[PDB]
């Protein structure tokens, strides 16, 4: 993409696991991030599913510079602009639309949109994208689906998400067409509530180490 | 929606079950509709899958005022115009296209379009819709798929249809994102052939009661 | 389709099996085509997944006129125009986009695009298409998924592809909505490299024999 300094590819190749984060209380944003980074996980997807979403992104950006902070659940050109202004380094969407693809390519940060079918993948490719989110992974047909897609689209790379856990993330990471996976298991809800950042670091650490094959 | 008198939500929240009707003989339309209303089910989806489908919608619209009649299997603006002229109160489609979304938006009746993927859902949302049909429910991945597909979209409401039986509709109705389900067991062909309307009313009553709690 | 001299339907009703061909060495193209024809299979889908793909179509068109050669993995207008110019008698794509559909309808040869959802099916139907590819068939939910997707659309026919084999192709061919299936087992990569055309003719004859329903 002509206007992307940080390629989508670089974002997805930074690490094997990208935590899909849902921060309910702003205060938990930074400690959670530092907790994750401490465990070896740097690419953080802060989903726009809470009121403090945009503020948690800005906070993590200022206080945790090493973290590669981005926004998740970006659904339209305005949310994209909003997170871009708030310092998001990348944007991830559950699916794609033309208005979103357009505003993205014209923007400055990389967009890694989710797709479920090859028709959706083709729409994305028509806009020149090469990296995609495969969501929801299991529902879409999981590993087998990705293996089928690699036939007509050998150059395309994915980040499967949805139904991925330490019990199966290795099945996906093994595919050549898979660069990394998304998961929400790294940050247990109860964990933030209890201020158990220690646990979060162990999960992150275990995620990366278990990703070595 | 700006142009819709009746909200798509009102249609979906009128009752727990919306019958997906296939009536081949026009002479069975009205009594079948009254039988349904007698069982407590007043939102009737007559599918455009038979020759008399539209005439059936018109008859029910005129003769059964205690029922909210609409069209099913509406595939394009042409059919949307036809069912609207016929008196349909709402329109349901197996999936969606922009031409259909545009005609419905500018139209006067609510359209509850089906979707299988988040990109299809997002396209619908780009047109202002917030209520969708999840079809074919079972093939899309069932409750788990809907729980994932609905996850990043907290405000969206669905009406799952396809493979839904009395044996599993409670599993869907139990979902926070589900307002009602669509089922074709309330109007069995065999029962419609022998004019067994008492059986149809019972099926409606059981559907309504079996959905409680 | 007004602009297609040869209908999409005729392409799919030619035989029960359409080989999805991946040829890496141009010199193998002609003998391969002759071997398949000799086995009773003549609708050859040369996929655009190799550098010599287009020349292969040109050569087959030239040296094996009795075969109905076409292109697969056609992703956009440019490729559609390129294979059309090279002599392709039909085009197949993994999925569909509006630009590809518009260009195909304006063009001179039939496009049989893949779809996975009813919304994608409806988009294709908006452009007047009635024949589609169902890909990736198995990963999409197989026979059950196709039967559900086909439920509300009685006029459309399919060519399931993706994970189809002698073990299950009859399960698909048995469906009223299925005209034929696409498979790559008739031309194993090792057979091509070894120039083992007797084997290819055998697989073809066996494919045809085992499909009789």
PDB file of N, CA and C in Angstrom, chain A residues 98 116-120 122-123 125-126 139-141 144-145 148-149 151-153, chain C residues 49 73-76 93-97 99-100 114-117 120 135-136 139:
ATOM      1  N   UNK A  98     -16.666  -1.587   1.487  1.00  0.00           N
ATOM      2  CA  UNK A  98     -15.920  -0.731   0.585  1.00  0.00           C
ATOM      3  C   UNK A  98     -15.587   0.631   1.189  1.00  0.00           C
ATOM      4  N   UNK A 116     -14.394 -13.959   5.623  1.00  0.00           N
ATOM      5  CA  UNK A 116     -14.867 -15.303   5.910  1.00  0.00           C
ATOM      6  C   UNK A 116     -14.906 -16.121   4.620  1.00  0.00           C
ATOM      7  N   UNK A 117     -15.195 -15.461   3.498  1.00  0.00           N
ATOM      8  CA  UNK A 117     -15.287 -16.135   2.202  1.00  0.00           C
ATOM      9  C   UNK A 117     -14.259 -15.614   1.195  1.00  0.00           C
ATOM     10  N   UNK A 118     -14.053 -16.356   0.111  1.00  0.00           N
ATOM     11  CA  UNK A 118     -13.091 -15.920  -0.891  1.00  0.00           C
ATOM     12  C   UNK A 118     -13.609 -14.725  -1.687  1.00  0.00           C
ATOM     13  N   UNK A 119     -14.928 -14.542  -1.720  1.00  0.00           N
ATOM     14  CA  UNK A 119     -15.505 -13.393  -2.425  1.00  0.00           C
ATOM     15  C   UNK A 119     -15.121 -12.132  -1.639  1.00  0.00           C
ATOM     16  N   UNK A 120     -15.111 -12.249  -0.314  1.00  0.00           N
ATOM     17  CA  UNK A 120     -14.754 -11.127   0.554  1.00  0.00           C
ATOM     18  C   UNK A 120     -13.248 -10.892   0.439  1.00  0.00           C
ATOM     19  N   UNK A 122     -11.468 -11.512  -2.144  1.00  0.00           N
ATOM     20  CA  UNK A 122     -11.245 -10.889  -3.443  1.00  0.00           C
ATOM     21  C   UNK A 122     -11.564  -9.390  -3.430  1.00  0.00           C
ATOM     22  N   UNK A 123     -12.609  -9.000  -2.709  1.00  0.00           N
ATOM     23  CA  UNK A 123     -12.962  -7.581  -2.623  1.00  0.00           C
ATOM     24  C   UNK A 123     -11.771  -6.849  -2.005  1.00  0.00           C
ATOM     25  N   UNK A 125      -8.616  -7.790  -1.913  1.00  0.00           N
ATOM     26  CA  UNK A 125      -7.484  -7.816  -2.823  1.00  0.00           C
ATOM     27  C   UNK A 125      -7.663  -6.783  -3.932  1.00  0.00           C
ATOM     28  N   UNK A 126      -8.909  -6.521  -4.325  1.00  0.00           N
ATOM     29  CA  UNK A 126      -9.159  -5.527  -5.367  1.00  0.00           C
ATOM     30  C   UNK A 126      -8.696  -4.157  -4.880  1.00  0.00           C
ATOM     31  N   UNK A 139     -15.891 -21.016  12.716  1.00  0.00           N
ATOM     32  CA  UNK A 139     -17.105 -20.959  11.914  1.00  0.00           C
ATOM     33  C   UNK A 139     -16.806 -20.946  10.424  1.00  0.00           C
ATOM     34  N   UNK A 140     -15.727 -20.272  10.032  1.00  0.00           N
ATOM     35  CA  UNK A 140     -15.364 -20.193   8.619  1.00  0.00           C
ATOM     36  C   UNK A 140     -14.878 -21.524   8.045  1.00  0.00           C
ATOM     37  N   UNK A 141     -14.611 -22.495   8.912  1.00  0.00           N
ATOM     38  CA  UNK A 141     -14.127 -23.780   8.435  1.00  0.00           C
ATOM     39  C   UNK A 141     -12.727 -24.101   8.934  1.00  0.00           C
ATOM     40  N   UNK A 144      -8.868 -26.360   7.732  1.00  0.00           N
ATOM     41  CA  UNK A 144      -9.239 -26.907   6.429  1.00  0.00           C
ATOM     42  C   UNK A 144      -9.631 -25.810   5.439  1.00  0.00           C
ATOM     43  N   UNK A 145     -10.396 -24.829   5.901  1.00  0.00           N
ATOM     44  CA  UNK A 145     -10.809 -23.726   5.032  1.00  0.00           C
ATOM     45  C   UNK A 145      -9.576 -22.988   4.514  1.00  0.00           C
ATOM     46  N   UNK A 148      -7.756 -24.813   1.884  1.00  0.00           N
ATOM     47  CA  UNK A 148      -8.438 -24.783   0.595  1.00  0.00           C
ATOM     48  C   UNK A 148      -8.172 -23.449  -0.106  1.00  0.00           C
ATOM     49  N   UNK A 149      -8.246 -22.367   0.664  1.00  0.00           N
ATOM     50  CA  UNK A 149      -8.019 -21.022   0.144  1.00  0.00           C
ATOM     51  C   UNK A 149      -6.606 -20.825  -0.402  1.00  0.00           C
ATOM     52  N   UNK A 151      -4.999 -22.648  -2.167  1.00  0.00           N
ATOM     53  CA  UNK A 151      -4.896 -23.137  -3.532  1.00  0.00           C
ATOM     54  C   UNK A 151      -4.943 -22.003  -4.544  1.00  0.00           C
ATOM     55  N   UNK A 152      -6.067 -21.281  -4.622  1.00  0.00           N
ATOM     56  CA  UNK A 152      -6.153 -20.179  -5.582  1.00  0.00           C
ATOM     57  C   UNK A 152      -5.434 -18.908  -5.121  1.00  0.00           C
ATOM     58  N   UNK A 153      -5.205 -18.781  -3.816  1.00  0.00           N
ATOM     59  CA  UNK A 153      -4.537 -17.596  -3.283  1.00  0.00           C
ATOM     60  C   UNK A 153      -3.323 -17.936  -2.425  1.00  0.00           C
TER      61      UNK A 153
ATOM     62  N   UNK C  49      -2.820 -20.303 -11.947  1.00  0.00           N
ATOM     63  CA  UNK C  49      -1.979 -20.400 -10.765  1.00  0.00           C
ATOM     64  C   UNK C  49      -0.521 -20.648 -11.116  1.00  0.00           C
ATOM     65  N   UNK C  73      -9.523 -19.713 -11.513  1.00  0.00           N
ATOM     66  CA  UNK C  73      -8.796 -18.763 -10.682  1.00  0.00           C
ATOM     67  C   UNK C  73      -8.704 -17.389 -11.368  1.00  0.00           C
ATOM     68  N   UNK C  74      -9.755 -17.037 -12.109  1.00  0.00           N
ATOM     69  CA  UNK C  74      -9.851 -15.746 -12.794  1.00  0.00           C
ATOM     70  C   UNK C  74     -10.345 -14.791 -11.706  1.00  0.00           C
ATOM     71  N   UNK C  75      -9.516 -13.825 -11.322  1.00  0.00           N
ATOM     72  CA  UNK C  75      -9.876 -12.939 -10.214  1.00  0.00           C
ATOM     73  C   UNK C  75     -10.384 -11.537 -10.516  1.00  0.00           C
ATOM     74  N   UNK C  76     -10.217 -11.079 -11.744  1.00  0.00           N
ATOM     75  CA  UNK C  76     -10.647  -9.732 -12.070  1.00  0.00           C
ATOM     76  C   UNK C  76     -10.836  -9.563 -13.570  1.00  0.00           C
ATOM     77  N   UNK C  93     -14.085 -18.614 -11.359  1.00  0.00           N
ATOM     78  CA  UNK C  93     -13.413 -17.846 -10.315  1.00  0.00           C
ATOM     79  C   UNK C  93     -13.765 -18.468  -8.966  1.00  0.00           C
ATOM     80  N   UNK C  94     -12.874 -18.336  -7.966  1.00  0.00           N
ATOM     81  CA  UNK C  94     -13.069 -18.881  -6.612  1.00  0.00           C
ATOM     82  C   UNK C  94     -14.247 -18.212  -5.915  1.00  0.00           C
ATOM     83  N   UNK C  95     -14.458 -16.944  -6.254  1.00  0.00           N
ATOM     84  CA  UNK C  95     -15.543 -16.168  -5.679  1.00  0.00           C
ATOM     85  C   UNK C  95     -15.921 -15.087  -6.672  1.00  0.00           C
ATOM     86  N   UNK C  96     -16.727 -14.121  -6.244  1.00  0.00           N
ATOM     87  CA  UNK C  96     -17.148 -13.060  -7.146  1.00  0.00           C
ATOM     88  C   UNK C  96     -17.068 -11.655  -6.537  1.00  0.00           C
ATOM     89  N   UNK C  97     -16.912 -10.666  -7.410  1.00  0.00           N
ATOM     90  CA  UNK C  97     -16.868  -9.257  -7.021  1.00  0.00           C
ATOM     91  C   UNK C  97     -17.713  -8.578  -8.083  1.00  0.00           C
ATOM     92  N   UNK C  99     -17.050  -5.961 -10.033  1.00  0.00           N
ATOM     93  CA  UNK C  99     -16.338  -5.650 -11.279  1.00  0.00           C
ATOM     94  C   UNK C  99     -16.159  -6.886 -12.164  1.00  0.00           C
ATOM     95  N   UNK C 100     -15.850  -8.019 -11.539  1.00  0.00           N
ATOM     96  CA  UNK C 100     -15.672  -9.257 -12.291  1.00  0.00           C
ATOM     97  C   UNK C 100     -16.982  -9.680 -12.944  1.00  0.00           C
ATOM     98  N   UNK C 114     -17.624 -18.715  -8.010  1.00  0.00           N
ATOM     99  CA  UNK C 114     -17.888 -19.399  -6.767  1.00  0.00           C
ATOM    100  C   UNK C 114     -18.575 -18.491  -5.762  1.00  0.00           C
ATOM    101  N   UNK C 115     -19.404 -19.097  -4.919  1.00  0.00           N
ATOM    102  CA  UNK C 115     -20.097 -18.385  -3.862  1.00  0.00           C
ATOM    103  C   UNK C 115     -20.066 -19.299  -2.640  1.00  0.00           C
ATOM    104  N   UNK C 116     -20.219 -18.715  -1.456  1.00  0.00           N
ATOM    105  CA  UNK C 116     -20.229 -19.489  -0.224  1.00  0.00           C
ATOM    106  C   UNK C 116     -21.481 -19.161   0.582  1.00  0.00           C
ATOM    107  N   UNK C 117     -22.074 -17.996   0.336  1.00  0.00           N
ATOM    108  CA  UNK C 117     -23.259 -17.589   1.083  1.00  0.00           C
ATOM    109  C   UNK C 117     -24.395 -17.208   0.146  1.00  0.00           C
ATOM    110  N   UNK C 120     -23.916 -13.762  -1.537  1.00  0.00           N
ATOM    111  CA  UNK C 120     -23.030 -13.772  -2.695  1.00  0.00           C
ATOM    112  C   UNK C 120     -23.791 -14.349  -3.883  1.00  0.00           C
ATOM    113  N   UNK C 135     -17.571 -23.078  -3.506  1.00  0.00           N
ATOM    114  CA  UNK C 135     -16.205 -23.260  -3.035  1.00  0.00           C
ATOM    115  C   UNK C 135     -15.852 -22.419  -1.804  1.00  0.00           C
ATOM    116  N   UNK C 136     -15.121 -23.007  -0.838  1.00  0.00           N
ATOM    117  CA  UNK C 136     -14.641 -24.399  -0.858  1.00  0.00           C
ATOM    118  C   UNK C 136     -15.763 -25.267  -0.295  1.00  0.00           C
ATOM    119  N   UNK C 139     -15.113 -27.435   3.153  1.00  0.00           N
ATOM    120  CA  UNK C 139     -14.853 -26.476   4.215  1.00  0.00           C
ATOM    121  C   UNK C 139     -16.064 -25.592   4.522  1.00  0.00           C
TER     122      UNK C 139
END
